[PDB]
Coordinates of C-alpha atoms and ligand atoms in Angstrom, one line a residue:
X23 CA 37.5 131.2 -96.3
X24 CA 35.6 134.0 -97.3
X25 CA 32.3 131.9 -98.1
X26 CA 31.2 134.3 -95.8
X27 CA 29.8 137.5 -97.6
X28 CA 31.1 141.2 -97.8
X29 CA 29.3 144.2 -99.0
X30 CA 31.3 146.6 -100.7
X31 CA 28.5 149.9 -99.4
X32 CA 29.6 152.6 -102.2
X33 CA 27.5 155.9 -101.6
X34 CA 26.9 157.8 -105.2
X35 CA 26.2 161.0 -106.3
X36 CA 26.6 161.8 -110.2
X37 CA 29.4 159.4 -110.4
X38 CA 28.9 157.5 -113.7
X39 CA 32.1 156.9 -115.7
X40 CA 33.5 155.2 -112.5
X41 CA 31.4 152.6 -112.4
X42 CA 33.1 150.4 -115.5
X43 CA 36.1 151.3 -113.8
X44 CA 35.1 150.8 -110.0
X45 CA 33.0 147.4 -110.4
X46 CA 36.0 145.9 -112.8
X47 CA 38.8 146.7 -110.3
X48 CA 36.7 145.5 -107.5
X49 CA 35.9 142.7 -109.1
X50 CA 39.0 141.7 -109.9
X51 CA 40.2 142.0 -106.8
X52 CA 37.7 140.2 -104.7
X53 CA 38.1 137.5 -107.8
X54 CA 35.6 133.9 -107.3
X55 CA 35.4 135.0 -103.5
X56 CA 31.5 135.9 -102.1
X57 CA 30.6 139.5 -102.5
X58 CA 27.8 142.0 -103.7
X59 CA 28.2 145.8 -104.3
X60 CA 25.5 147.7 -102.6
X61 CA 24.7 151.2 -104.6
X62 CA 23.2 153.7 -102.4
X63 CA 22.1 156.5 -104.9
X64 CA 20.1 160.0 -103.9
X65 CA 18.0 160.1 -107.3
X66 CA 21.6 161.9 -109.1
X67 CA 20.2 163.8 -112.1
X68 CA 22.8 162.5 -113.6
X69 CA 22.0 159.0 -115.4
X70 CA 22.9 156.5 -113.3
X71 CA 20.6 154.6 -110.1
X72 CA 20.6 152.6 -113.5
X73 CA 23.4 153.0 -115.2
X74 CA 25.2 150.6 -112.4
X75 CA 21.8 148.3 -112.9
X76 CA 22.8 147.2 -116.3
X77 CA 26.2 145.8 -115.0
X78 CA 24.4 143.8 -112.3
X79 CA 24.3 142.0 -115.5
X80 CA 28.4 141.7 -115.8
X81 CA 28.7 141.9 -111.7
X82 CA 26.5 141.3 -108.5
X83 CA 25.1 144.5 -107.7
X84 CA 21.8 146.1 -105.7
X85 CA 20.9 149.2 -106.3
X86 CA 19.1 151.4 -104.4
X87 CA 17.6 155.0 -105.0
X88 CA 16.6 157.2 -102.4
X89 CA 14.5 159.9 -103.3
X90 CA 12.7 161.2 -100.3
X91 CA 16.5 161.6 -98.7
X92 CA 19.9 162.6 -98.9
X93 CA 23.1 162.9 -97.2
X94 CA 26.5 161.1 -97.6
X95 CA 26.4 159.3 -94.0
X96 CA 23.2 158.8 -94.3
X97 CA 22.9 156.4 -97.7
X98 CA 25.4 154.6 -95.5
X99 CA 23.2 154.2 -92.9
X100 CA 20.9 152.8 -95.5
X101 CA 23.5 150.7 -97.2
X102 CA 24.4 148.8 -93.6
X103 CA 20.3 148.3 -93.7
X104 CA 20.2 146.8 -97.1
X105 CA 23.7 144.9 -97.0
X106 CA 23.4 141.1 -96.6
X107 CA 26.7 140.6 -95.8
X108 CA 29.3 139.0 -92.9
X109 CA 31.8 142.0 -93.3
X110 CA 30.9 145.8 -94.6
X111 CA 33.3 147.5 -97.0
X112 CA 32.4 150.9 -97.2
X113 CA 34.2 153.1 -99.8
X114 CA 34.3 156.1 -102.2
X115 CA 32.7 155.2 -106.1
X116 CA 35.5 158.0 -107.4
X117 CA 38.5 155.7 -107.6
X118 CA 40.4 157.8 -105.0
X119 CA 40.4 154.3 -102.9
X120 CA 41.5 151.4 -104.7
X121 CA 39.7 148.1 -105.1
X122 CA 43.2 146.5 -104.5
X123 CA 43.7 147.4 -101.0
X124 CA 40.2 145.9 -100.0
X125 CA 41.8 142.3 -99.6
X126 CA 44.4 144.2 -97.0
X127 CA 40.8 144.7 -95.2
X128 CA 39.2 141.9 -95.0
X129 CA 42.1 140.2 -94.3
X130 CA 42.7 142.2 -91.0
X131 CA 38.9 141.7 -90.5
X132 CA 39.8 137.8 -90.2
X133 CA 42.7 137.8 -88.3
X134 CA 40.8 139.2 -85.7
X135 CA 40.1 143.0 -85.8
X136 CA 36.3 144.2 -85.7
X137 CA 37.0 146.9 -87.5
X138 CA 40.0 148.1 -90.5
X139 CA 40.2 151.4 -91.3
X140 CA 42.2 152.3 -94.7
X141 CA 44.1 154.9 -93.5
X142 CA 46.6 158.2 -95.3
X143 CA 48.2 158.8 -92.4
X144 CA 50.0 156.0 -90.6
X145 CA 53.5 154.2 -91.6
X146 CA 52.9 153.3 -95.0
X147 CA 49.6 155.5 -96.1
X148 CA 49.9 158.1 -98.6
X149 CA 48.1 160.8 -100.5
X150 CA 49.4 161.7 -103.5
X151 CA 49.6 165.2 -105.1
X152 CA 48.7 166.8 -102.3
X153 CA 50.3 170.3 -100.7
X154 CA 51.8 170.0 -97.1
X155 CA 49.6 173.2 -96.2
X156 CA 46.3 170.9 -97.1
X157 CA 47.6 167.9 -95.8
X158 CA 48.5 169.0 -92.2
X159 CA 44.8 171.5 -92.2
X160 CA 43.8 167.7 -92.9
X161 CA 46.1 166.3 -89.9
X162 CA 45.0 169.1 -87.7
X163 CA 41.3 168.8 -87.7
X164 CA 41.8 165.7 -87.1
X165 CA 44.0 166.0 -84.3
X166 CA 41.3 168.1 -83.1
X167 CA 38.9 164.9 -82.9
X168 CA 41.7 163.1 -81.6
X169 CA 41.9 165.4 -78.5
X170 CA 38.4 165.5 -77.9
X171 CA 37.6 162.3 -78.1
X172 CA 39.9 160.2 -75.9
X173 CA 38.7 157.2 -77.2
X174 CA 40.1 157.9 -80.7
X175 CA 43.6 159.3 -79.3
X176 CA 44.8 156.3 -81.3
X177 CA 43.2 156.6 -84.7
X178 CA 45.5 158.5 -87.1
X179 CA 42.5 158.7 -89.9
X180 CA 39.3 158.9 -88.0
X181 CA 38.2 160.6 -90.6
X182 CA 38.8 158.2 -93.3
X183 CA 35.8 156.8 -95.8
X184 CA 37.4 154.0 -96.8
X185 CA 36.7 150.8 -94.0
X186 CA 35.4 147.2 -93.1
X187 CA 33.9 146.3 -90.4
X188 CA 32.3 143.0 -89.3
X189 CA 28.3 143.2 -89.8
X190 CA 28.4 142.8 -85.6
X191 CA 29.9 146.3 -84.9
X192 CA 26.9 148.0 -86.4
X193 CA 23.8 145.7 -85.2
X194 CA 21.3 147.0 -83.2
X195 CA 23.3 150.4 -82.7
X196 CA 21.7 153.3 -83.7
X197 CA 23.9 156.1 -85.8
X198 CA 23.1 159.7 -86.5
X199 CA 22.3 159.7 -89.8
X200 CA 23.9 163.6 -90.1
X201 CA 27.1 164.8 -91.8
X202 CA 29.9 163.1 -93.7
X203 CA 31.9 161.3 -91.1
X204 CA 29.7 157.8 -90.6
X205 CA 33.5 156.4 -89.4
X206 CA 33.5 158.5 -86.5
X207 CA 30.1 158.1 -85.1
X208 CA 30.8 153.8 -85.4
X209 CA 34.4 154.4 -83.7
X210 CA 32.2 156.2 -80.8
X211 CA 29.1 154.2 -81.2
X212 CA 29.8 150.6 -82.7
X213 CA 30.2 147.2 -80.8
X214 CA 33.9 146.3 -81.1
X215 CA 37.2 145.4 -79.2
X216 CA 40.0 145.7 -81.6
X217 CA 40.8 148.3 -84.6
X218 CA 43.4 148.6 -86.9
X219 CA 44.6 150.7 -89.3
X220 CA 45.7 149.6 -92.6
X221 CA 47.8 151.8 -94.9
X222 CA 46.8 152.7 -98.5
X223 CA 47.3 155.5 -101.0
X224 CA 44.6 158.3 -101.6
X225 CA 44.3 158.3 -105.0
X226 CA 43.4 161.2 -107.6
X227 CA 40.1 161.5 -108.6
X228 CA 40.3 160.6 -112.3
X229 CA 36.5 161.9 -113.7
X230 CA 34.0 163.9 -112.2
X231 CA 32.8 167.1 -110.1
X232 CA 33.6 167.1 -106.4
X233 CA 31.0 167.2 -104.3
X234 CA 32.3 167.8 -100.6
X235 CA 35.2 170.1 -100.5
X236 CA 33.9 172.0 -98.9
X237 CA 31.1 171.6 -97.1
X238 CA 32.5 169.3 -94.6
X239 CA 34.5 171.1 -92.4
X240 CA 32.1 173.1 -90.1
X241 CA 29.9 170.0 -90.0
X242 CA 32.8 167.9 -88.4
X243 CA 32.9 170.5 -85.6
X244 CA 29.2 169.7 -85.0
X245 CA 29.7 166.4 -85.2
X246 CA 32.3 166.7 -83.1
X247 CA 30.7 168.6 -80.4
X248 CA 27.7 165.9 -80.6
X249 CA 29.9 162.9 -80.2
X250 CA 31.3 165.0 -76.7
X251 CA 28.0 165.0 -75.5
X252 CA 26.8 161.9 -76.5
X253 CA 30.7 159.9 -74.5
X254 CA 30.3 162.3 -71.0
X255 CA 32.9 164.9 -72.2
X256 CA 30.6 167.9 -72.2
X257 CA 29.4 166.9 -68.6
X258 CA 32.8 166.6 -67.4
X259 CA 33.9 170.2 -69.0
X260 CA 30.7 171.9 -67.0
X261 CA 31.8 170.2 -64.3
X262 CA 35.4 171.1 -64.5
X263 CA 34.1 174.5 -64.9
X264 CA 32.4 174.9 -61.5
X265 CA 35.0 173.4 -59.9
X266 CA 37.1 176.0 -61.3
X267 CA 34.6 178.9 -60.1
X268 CA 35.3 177.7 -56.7
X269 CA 38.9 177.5 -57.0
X270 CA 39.0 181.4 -58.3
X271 CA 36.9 182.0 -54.9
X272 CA 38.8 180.2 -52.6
X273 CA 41.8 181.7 -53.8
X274 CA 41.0 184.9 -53.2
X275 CA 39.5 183.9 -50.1
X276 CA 42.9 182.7 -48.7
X277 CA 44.4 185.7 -50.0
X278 CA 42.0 188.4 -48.1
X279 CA 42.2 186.0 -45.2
X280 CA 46.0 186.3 -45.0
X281 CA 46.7 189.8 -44.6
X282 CA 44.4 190.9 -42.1
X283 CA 46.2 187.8 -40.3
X284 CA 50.0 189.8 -40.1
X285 CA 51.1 188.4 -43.5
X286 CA 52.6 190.8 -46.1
X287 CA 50.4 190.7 -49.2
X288 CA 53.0 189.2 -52.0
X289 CA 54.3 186.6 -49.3
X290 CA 50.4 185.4 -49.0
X291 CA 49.7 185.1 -52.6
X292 CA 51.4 181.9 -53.0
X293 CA 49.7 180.0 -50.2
X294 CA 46.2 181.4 -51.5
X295 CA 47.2 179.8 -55.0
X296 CA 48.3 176.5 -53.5
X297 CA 44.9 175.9 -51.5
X298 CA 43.1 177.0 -54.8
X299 CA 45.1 174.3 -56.6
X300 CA 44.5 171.7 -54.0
X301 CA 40.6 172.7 -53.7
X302 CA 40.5 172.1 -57.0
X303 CA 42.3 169.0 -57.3
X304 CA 40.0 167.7 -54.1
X305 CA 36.5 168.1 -56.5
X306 CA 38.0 167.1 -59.5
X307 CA 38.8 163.6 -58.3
X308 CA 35.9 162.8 -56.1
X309 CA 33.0 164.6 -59.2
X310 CA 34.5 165.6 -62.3
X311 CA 36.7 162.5 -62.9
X312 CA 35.3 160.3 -60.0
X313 CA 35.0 157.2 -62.6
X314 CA 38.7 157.5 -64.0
X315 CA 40.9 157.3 -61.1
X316 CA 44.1 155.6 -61.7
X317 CA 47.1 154.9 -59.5
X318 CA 48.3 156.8 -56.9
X319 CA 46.4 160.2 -55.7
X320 CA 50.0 161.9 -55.5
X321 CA 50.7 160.9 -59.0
X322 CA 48.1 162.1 -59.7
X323 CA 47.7 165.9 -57.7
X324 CA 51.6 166.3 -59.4
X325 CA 50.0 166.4 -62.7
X326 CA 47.3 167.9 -62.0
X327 CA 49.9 171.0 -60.7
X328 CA 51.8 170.9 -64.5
X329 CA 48.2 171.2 -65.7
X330 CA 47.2 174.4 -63.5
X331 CA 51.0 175.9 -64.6
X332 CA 50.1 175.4 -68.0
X333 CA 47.0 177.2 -67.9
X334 CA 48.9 179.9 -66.3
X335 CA 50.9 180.2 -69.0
X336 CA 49.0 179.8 -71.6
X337 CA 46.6 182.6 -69.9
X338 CA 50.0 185.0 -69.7
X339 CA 51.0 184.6 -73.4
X340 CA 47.9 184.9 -75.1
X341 CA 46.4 187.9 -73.0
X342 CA 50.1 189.5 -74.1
X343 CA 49.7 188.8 -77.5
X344 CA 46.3 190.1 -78.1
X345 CA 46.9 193.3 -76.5
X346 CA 50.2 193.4 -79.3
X347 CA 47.2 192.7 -81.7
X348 CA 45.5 195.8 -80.4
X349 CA 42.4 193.8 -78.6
X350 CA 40.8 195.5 -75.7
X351 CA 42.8 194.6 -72.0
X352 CA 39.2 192.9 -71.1
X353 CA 38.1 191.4 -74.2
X354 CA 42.2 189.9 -73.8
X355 CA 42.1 189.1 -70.5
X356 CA 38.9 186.8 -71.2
X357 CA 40.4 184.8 -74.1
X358 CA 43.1 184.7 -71.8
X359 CA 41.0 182.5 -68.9
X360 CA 38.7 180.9 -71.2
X361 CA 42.1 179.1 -73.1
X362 CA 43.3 178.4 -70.1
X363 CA 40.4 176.7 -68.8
X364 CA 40.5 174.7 -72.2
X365 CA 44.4 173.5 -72.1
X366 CA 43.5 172.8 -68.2
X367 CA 40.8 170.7 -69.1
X368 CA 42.9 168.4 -71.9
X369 CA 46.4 168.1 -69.7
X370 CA 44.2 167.3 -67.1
X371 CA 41.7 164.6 -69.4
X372 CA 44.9 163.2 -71.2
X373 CA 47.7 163.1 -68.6
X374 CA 46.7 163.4 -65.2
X375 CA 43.2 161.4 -65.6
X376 CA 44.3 159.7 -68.6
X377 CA 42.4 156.7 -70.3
Ligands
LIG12 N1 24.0 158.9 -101.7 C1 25.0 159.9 -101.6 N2 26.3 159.7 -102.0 C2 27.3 160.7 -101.9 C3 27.0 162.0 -101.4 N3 28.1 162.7 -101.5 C4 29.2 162.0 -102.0 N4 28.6 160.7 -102.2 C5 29.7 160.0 -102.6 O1 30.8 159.9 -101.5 C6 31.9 160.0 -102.1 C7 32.6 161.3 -101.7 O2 32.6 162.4 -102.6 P1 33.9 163.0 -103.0 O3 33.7 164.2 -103.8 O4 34.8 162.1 -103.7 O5 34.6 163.5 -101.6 P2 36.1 163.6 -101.2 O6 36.4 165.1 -101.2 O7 37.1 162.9 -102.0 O8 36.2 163.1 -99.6 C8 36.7 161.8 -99.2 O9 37.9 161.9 -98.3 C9 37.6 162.4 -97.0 C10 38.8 162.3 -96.1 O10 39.9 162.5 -97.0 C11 36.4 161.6 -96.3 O11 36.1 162.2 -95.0 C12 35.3 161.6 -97.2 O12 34.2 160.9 -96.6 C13 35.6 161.0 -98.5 O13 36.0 159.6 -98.4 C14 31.6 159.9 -103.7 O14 31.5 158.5 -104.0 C15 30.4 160.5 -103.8 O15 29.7 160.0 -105.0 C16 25.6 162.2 -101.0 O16 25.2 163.3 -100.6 N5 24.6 161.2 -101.1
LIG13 C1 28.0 178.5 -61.0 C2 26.6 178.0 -61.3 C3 26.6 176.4 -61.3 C4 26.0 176.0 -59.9 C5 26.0 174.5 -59.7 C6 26.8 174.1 -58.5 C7 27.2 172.6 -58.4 C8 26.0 171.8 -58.9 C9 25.6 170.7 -57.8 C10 26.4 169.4 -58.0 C11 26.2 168.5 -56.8 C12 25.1 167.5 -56.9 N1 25.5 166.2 -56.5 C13 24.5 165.2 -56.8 C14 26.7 165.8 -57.3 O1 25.8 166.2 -55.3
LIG14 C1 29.9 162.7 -55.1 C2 30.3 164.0 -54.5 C3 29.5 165.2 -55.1 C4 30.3 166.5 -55.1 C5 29.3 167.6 -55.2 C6 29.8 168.7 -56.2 C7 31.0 169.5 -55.6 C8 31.0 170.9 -56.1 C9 31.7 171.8 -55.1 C10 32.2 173.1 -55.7 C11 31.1 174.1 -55.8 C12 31.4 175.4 -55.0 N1 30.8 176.5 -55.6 C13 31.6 177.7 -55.3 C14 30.7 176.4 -57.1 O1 29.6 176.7 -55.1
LIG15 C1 56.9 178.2 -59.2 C2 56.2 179.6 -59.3 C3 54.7 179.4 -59.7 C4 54.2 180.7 -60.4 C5 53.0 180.4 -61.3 C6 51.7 180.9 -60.7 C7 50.7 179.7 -60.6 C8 49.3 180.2 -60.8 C9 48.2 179.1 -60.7 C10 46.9 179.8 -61.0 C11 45.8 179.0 -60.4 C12 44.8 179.9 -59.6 N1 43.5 179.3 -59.7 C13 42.5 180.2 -59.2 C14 43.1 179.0 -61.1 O1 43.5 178.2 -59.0
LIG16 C1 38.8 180.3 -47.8 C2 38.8 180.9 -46.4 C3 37.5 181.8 -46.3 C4 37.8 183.2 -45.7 C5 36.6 184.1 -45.8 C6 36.9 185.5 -46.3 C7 35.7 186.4 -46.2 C8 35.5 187.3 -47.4 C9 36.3 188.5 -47.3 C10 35.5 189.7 -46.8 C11 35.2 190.6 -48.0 C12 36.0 191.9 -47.9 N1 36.1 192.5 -49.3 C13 37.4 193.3 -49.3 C14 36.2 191.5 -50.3 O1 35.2 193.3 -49.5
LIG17 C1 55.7 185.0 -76.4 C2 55.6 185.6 -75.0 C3 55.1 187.0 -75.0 C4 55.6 187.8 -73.8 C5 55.2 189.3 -73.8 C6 56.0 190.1 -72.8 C7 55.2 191.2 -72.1 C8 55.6 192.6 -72.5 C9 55.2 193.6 -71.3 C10 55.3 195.0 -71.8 C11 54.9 196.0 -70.7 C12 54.9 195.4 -69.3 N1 56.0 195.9 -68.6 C13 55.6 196.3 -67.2 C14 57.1 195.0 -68.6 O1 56.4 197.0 -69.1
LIG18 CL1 42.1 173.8 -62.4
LIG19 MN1 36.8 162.0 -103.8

């Protein structure tokens, strides 16, 4: 079936020795079917834009220098352009993802999915020779993207470098040509409907000098905080914000309201909080999350109380914990409400507003 072309999109940067062993397993693996390589080199000092021109001779490869620019991400960018392919493979020239698995892709590609991610980290993936305390840093920024992005909840290797995607995903959609993390910006940016996630195993480099770790990891933050603005999420944390200005007033509105009224002063605290919970609730639905309103408005005010208790909480244990640490009560005390603003927000984003 696959008359219809793949480009295998392999970004380079003084990777040399691979090459023989890169375009032969590939090769091998995508055996009499339709496929070019697509080499998108930064002028590496190192010999090759050329060295992978003389086995265009042995294999079907177009190479391309760029000289003027640079960036991992971005050579991708400029691979997509170049690529005359049906289906984009993009992968690592290093031989940490194998040729072999690249069938597994394309396959899922067929079968129906827009997009096939190779992927460490779900049943089945692996990464070999790897310590636990890297591999769950790895995990954790991640899950970090994960939470912040709601509409890669799902994805267990966002992160990844190794994918396919059908030439459709990417047309006519324009990507940020910064950082390192071109998979991310197409799962919040492409054109597509289903994803999957195929398991494979991160191989070892076996020659050469890295050149990432670690750069990456601050990057990925930025990126991160782009992609929030770019899908609403910043909007919706100001918002979330205000809202919970006017709650912190209205409570203590309630509260000074109350005991010039007869009530005893720790008898009116709780209906001052309640209001202040419900005031909150009341703006939240109708502005903040207007547009992702889902079954009933109890359901949903319950939640939103867990949420409120959990920044409560969360506020409680870590302004006790700094002043164990020795922090300043007011330099405490503000962690404390700004971290409970933040679990507020995701409970709140995830569970009680969830999409
Ligand atoms: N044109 C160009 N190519 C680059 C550049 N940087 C790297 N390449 C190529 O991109 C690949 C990544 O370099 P590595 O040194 O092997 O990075 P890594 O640490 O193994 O990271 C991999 O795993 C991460 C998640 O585990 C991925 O996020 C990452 O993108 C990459 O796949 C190599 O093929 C390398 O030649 C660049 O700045 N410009
Ligand atoms: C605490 C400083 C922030 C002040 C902003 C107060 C709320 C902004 C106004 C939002 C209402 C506008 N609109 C169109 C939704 O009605
Ligand atoms: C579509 C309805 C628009 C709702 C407008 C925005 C509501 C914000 C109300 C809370 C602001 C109160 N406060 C104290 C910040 O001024
Ligand atoms: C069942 C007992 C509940 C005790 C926990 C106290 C709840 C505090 C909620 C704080 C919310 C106040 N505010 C201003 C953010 O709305
Ligand atoms: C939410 C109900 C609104 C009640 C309004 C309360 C008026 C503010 C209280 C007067 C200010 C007195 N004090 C002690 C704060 O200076
Ligand atoms: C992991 C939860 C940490 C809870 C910290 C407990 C607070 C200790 C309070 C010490 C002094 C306050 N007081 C009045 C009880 O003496
Ligand atoms: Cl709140
Ligand atoms: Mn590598």
């Amino acid at each position: 079936f696959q008359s219809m072309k793949v480009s295998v999109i392999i970004p380079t940067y003084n990777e040399r020795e691979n090459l023989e062993e890169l375009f032969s397993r590939i090769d091998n693996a995508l055996q009499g079917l339709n496929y070019e390589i697509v080499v998108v080199d930064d002028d590496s000092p190192d010999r090759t834009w050329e060295k992978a021109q003389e086995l265009s001779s042995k294999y079907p490869v177009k190479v391309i220098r760029r000289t003027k620019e640079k960036g991992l991400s971005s050579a991708v960018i400029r691979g997509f352009k170049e690529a005359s392919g049906d289906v984009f493979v993009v992968m690592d020239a290093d031989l940490q993802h194998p040729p072999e698995v690249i069938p597994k892709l394309i396959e899922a590609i067929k079968n129906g999915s827009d997009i096939a991610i190779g992927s460490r980290y779900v049943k089945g993936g692996k990464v070999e020779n790897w310590p636990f305390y890297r591999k769950l840093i790895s995990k954790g920024a991640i899950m970090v993207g994960r939470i912040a992005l709601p509409k890669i909840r799902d994805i267990k290797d966002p992160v990844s470098g190794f994918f396919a995607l059908r030439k459709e995903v990417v047309e006519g959609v324009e990507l940020n040509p910064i950082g390192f993390k071109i998979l991310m910006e197409i799962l919040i940016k492409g054109k597509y409907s289903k994803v999957v996630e195929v398991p494979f195993t991160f191989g070892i480099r076996a020659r050469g000098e890295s050149k990432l770790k670690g750069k990456t990891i601050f990057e990925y933050l930025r990126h991160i905080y782009r992609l929030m603005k770019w899908e609403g999420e910043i909007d919706r944390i100001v918002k979330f914000s205000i809202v919970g200005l006017s709650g912190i007033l209205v409570n203590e509105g309630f509260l000074w309201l109350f005991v010039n009224l007869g009530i005893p002063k720790e008898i009116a605290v709780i209906p001052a909080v309640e209001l202040s919970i419900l005031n909150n609730f009341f703006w939240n639905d109708i502005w903040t999350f207007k547009d992702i309103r889902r079954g009933s408005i109890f359901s949903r005010l319950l939640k939103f109380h867990i949420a409120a208790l959990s920044g409560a909480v969360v506020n409680f244990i870590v302004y006790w914990i700094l002043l164990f640490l020795g922090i300043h009560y007011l330099i405490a005390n503000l962690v404390g409400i700004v971290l409970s603003f933040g679990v507020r927000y995701v409970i709140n984003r995830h569970v009680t507003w969830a999409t």
